Design a protein around this nucleic acid. Structure first.
Ligand SMILES: Nc1ncnc2c1ncn2[C@@H]1O[C@H](COP(=O)(O)OP(=O)(O)O)[C@@H](O)[C@H]1O
Ligand code: SF4
Ligand code: SF4
Ligand SMILES: [Mg+2]
Lengths: 416, 194, 57, 62
RNA sequence: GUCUCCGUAGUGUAGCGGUUAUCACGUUCGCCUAACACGCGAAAGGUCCUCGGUUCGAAACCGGGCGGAAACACCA
RNA sequence: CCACUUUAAAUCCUUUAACGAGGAUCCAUUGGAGGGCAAGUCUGGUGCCAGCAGCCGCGGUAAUUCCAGCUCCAAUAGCGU
RNA sequence: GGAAGGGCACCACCAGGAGUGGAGCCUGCGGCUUAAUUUGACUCAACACGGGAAACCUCACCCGGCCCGGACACGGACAGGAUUGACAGAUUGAUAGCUCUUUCUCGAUUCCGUGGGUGGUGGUGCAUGGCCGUUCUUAGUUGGUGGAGCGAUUUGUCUGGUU
RNA sequence: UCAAAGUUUGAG
């Protein structure tokens, strides 16, 4: 289900927030990630020698901490017997927190996406750079490696490299050694060679499409032998699929070994793509400003007022705002309100006296905005679009307009 | 290499009547930056073309169209001979009078031709886009301008102008033509000119 | 690897203070006089295991 | 030190000393009439009970 | 398409119709070591590819299934 | 700053009247203070970070080595790189 | 030093004993578990050790509730009594006056600041003392004055026999 | 009058 997946992402994001905060005085913390294919024994051994080494650590508080963590991460791994699919992510240590409370913790879990990123570390802190880099890069891209020998269809995350389906074929010989039959055999060879392409072009629809919509934001075709092109520019390959043909890549090698080659030759394009789509969206946002229209908005005050009401269509936000939603509160009267304060206005501000009554209006702690949108953009109007300051249209959005706004579902006049 | 000028027609802007509008509509100003400064008091709406995007929203909004934003080549920010105010017209370079020669100015009007001529007459000091004389001359070395302006400042060169609007000479000078030529004579060559 | 982030980390957060108001310090020759006087003529005391000009227990 | 909202603190007492306390009345200037009942060993008035302020003795008429 | 063969603990393989399914490696648990490795002692672990048949009895013999691999595709 | 002098004509010095100092002022800097190498085991912040350091090094929660305050030292209409 | 000489110790061997390792249990660790399962010590030189055989106490741990045992000062606070201590009855686990309603009270205690204390089986034995243990149960160790080396050092403290 | 015996925190 989609809702259960969104809960598991929120769970993991919250886990990361805590682990980045954690910290512990003295001590170290086992960052650890065991990729899908790995043998867990291999990990147990590694740990066991990492243990034996750590027993010569000169510092006590560090030593005994590290030994403890390694003792306990081994015990976690004992509860699994094969590596869970989609990898494993363990995070031992002895985190410190408020109240002077030294507490041990051992968070292991199969992460929801497969991942292809091993890591081991002892250091003062935990390392969750891998994990954030697997929530950021959703963008699944489809690969199809055509060759005279055979095909390979496969999907692709940031790091993760899946193999969907494949086959090979006995295509005919190049030549027909009779004078007349030469011509017929040629025409016949052309028919079976094309038929193979027809099969590939159907299979790709069968694999990379789902509910009359392609599941992959690109569709890299690869290979050699002027074949990938024969697919690329045919009437057989479905136009919604062929719309997202993103590259024809000439690879040496074929099949599985062909795959990796096809990805490394593709790397540059799949980066550009994410920026291209961003440029396109904001480009439209600006079109509504360029023409009078009315169906745009900008600056929290206006934008959220548009959201609250007959909502926006698309809401565009620069992926980090500073800007933060605070929940202000009164001591005596119990009257309360909420405000969207800038980095300067949030840090120190004499504004927040109650004035009418005459008391110090205390600001109960914040929830940072971009995250606030991410929580509850669905309870409004939808399509929360994170953007960047890399493109010229991107920067103009971030710099000028404030990296916040949205394309509206109809024309609205604003006042004050 | 492209920058922006903002221009405010001091006649068409009436900040009291319209109650702002530019302030409210400008994203930079909503962003929280001093891109426009107006108030109901104070004539003429100011803009920091520095902080301006050049969104082209304020231009649409203002109810008399007082605000005109344009672009201009980044080259030309060096060679700025005169700018009368903030958000005013901006001449770049001057003509290069050479003596013994009639200098033909050409181009469409509303393009600083009068400002050029005032400057060259010496009535106008070319502020050089500051809004001085030794600092001015030094800016015009290597070029006939420095000889021109230096010549102006020690021997006061008399600046004489045949104006554009000919029909505001009548409403000023009285008497006959023959009388007026005699009064203004100095060369003593009326008959030859007539 | 490693970010170019923290940069001015410390200098930023240090506890800023004013630099007091003492005096116009004597300059040129007069300074030199005063220096000379405090090495040789004022103190010249009974010794007690070596000296210190900016020492402080 | 994240204190829980519904738990909160617990305030202690605040007394109210209402100026000079009156327990007496003036009957014909010279003589005096006491208002509240005294101890046997002012055993003051409750809404039903007669509670002491010192020796902790307690009484009531049903 | 044809004809052929092979599908057995985690891996690679033995297996002569009645077997606790053999061997090696790997795994786990002791020791040996300061530790680890090497070493020593122990232990766990086969859906015998799938289904049906024959047989008193089938992991094998016989049939069909899903997998996997060689050889042929010549004369115009 | 009057006036001479100067000078081709001037300026500058020079001479010279008249005004012209309580240091809040007419305000002296530049570099350093662990060793080489003169001079703080001082006081705050940072916590192998930021940073310093020609070299040796300092920095991983009492830093004589960082960022600051105080003092001190060298040279001084100059001193660094 | 898987270099040679000597020479020694049942925390070394040999000869043997009694064993431990096997079993059930007792108890200590580490793990897992848990509100909490407090913590120190991990080769000899941690693990029936902390004189640690915890019902409570111990106790640190956790989940609840009282209490001040907040000295002294400078002040503000001084009496239209600052504002220590209270049977009900509700509540509470509780015969905690802990709280709400109501009593009435020492009468000069108080409360609020600041300076500042004080305590803490809180953190740090890698900031220290003391005390242990271990090196290390062996025969080893030192300067004076002379001699030897620019010196670091060396000789004395030694070939041999002896113990 | 010679079998085998490889390695050693990045965590100061
Ligand atoms: N004194 C002034 N103060 C403010 N604005 C001026 C002044 N003189 C001219 N302008 C502005 O400059 C613009 C162009 O004038 P100008 O340059 O004199 O004409 P031209 O371009 O023909 O030489 C006018 O629109 C006017 O608003
Ligand atoms: S132009 Fe667009 S941006 Fe530049 S000022 Fe007027 S409004 Fe603000
Ligand atoms: S600019 Fe147009 S709008 Fe802004 S004040 Fe002057 S007139 Fe009113
Ligand atoms: Mg030095």
């Amino acid at each position: 289900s989609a809702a259960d997946r969104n809960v598991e992402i929120w769970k993991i994001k919250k886990l990361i927030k805590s682990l980045e905060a954690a910290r512990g005085n003295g001590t170290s913390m086992i960052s650890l990630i065991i990729p899908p294919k790995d043998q867990i024994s291999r990990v147990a051994k590694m740990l066991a020698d990492e243990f034996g080494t750590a027993s010569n650590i000169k510092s006590r508080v560090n030593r005994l901490s590290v030994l403890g963590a390694i003792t306990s991460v081994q015990q976690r791994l004992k509860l699994y017997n094969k590596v869970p699919p989609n990898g494993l992510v363990v995070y031992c240590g002895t985190i410190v927190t408020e109240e002077g409370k030294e507490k041990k913790v051992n968070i292991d879990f199969e992460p929801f996406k497969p991942i292809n990123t091993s890591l081991y570390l002892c250091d003062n802190k935990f390392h969750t750079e891998a994990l954030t880099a697997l929530l950021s890069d959703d963008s699944k891209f489809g690969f199809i490696v055509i060759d005279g020998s055979g095909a390979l269809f496969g999907t692709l995350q940031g790091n993760t490299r899946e193999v969907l389906h494949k086959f090979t074929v006995d295509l005919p010989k190049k030549h027909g050694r009779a004078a007349q039959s030469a011509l017929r055999f040629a025409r016949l060879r052309m028919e079976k060679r094309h038929n193979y392409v027809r099969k590939v072009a159907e299979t790709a629809v069968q694999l990379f499409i789902s509910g009359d919509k392609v599941n992959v934001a690109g569709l890299v075709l690869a290979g050699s032998a002027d074949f990938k092109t024969e697919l690329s520019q045919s009437d057989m390959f479905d136009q919604r699929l062929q719309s997202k043909v993103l590259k024809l890549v000439d690879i040496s090698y074929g099949g599985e070994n062909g795959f990796n080659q096809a990805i490394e030759l593709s790397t540059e394009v799949l980066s550009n793509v994410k920026f291209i789509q961003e440029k396109k969206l904001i480009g439209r946002y600006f079109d509504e400003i360029s023409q009078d229209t009315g169906k745009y908005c900008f600056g929290v005050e206006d934008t959220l007022k548009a959201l609250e009401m007959g909502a926006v269509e698309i809401l565009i936000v620069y992926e980090n705002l500073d800007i933060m939603r605070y929940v202000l509160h009164c001591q005596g009267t119990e009257e309360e309100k909420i405000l969207y304060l800038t980095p300067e206005q949030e840090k120190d501000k004499s504004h927040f006296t109650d004035k009418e009554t005459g008391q110090e209006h205390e600001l109960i702690e914040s929830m940072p905005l971009l995250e606030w949108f991410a929580n509850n953009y669905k309870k409004f109007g939808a399509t929360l679009e994170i953007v960047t300051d890399k493109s010229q249209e991107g920067s103009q959005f971030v710099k000028g307009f404030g990296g916040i706004g949205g394309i509206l579902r109809y024309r609205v006049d604003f006042q004050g | 290499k492209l920058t922006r000028i903002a221009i405010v027609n001091h006649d068409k802007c009436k900040p009291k009547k319209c109650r702002q509008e530019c302030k409210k509509s400008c994203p930079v100003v909503r962003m929280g930056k001093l891109c426009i400064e107006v108030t109901p008091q104070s004539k003429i709406a100011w803009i920091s073309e520095t902080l301006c995007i050049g969104c082209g929203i304020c231009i649409k909004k203002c109810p008399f169209g007082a605000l005109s934003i344009v672009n201009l080549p980044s080259n030309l920010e060096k060679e700025t001979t005169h700018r009368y105010c903030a958000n005013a017209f901006k001449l770049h370079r001057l003509p290069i009078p050479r003596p013994g020669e009639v200098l033909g100015l050409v181009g469409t009007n509303g393009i600083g031709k009068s400002t050029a001529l005032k400057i060259l007459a010496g009535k106008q000091k070319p502020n050089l886009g500051k809004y001085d004389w030794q600092e001015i001359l030094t800016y015009f070395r290597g070029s006939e301008l420095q000889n021109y302006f230096t010549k102006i400042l020690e021997d006061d060169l008399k600046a004489i102008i045949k104006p554009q609007y000919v029909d505001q000479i009548p409403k000023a000078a009285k008497g006959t033509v023959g009388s007026i030529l005699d009064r203004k004579d100095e060369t003593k060559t009326q008959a030859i000119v007539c | 690897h490693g970010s170019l982030a923290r940069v001015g980390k410390v200098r930023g957060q240090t506890l800023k203070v004013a630099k007091q108001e003492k005096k116009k310090k004597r300059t040129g020759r007069a300074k030199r006089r005063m220096q000379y006087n405090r090495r040789f003529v004022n103190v010249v005391p009974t010794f007690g295991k070596k000296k210190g000009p900016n020492a402080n227990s | 030190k994240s204190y829980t909202t519904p738990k909160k603190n617990k305030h202690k007492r605040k007394k109210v000393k209402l100026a000079v306390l009156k327990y007496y009345k003036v009957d014909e200037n010279g003589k005096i009439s006491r208002l509240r009942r005294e101890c046997p060993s002012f055993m003051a008035s409750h809404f039903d009970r007669h509670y002491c302020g010192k020796c902790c003795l307690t009484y009531c008429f049903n």
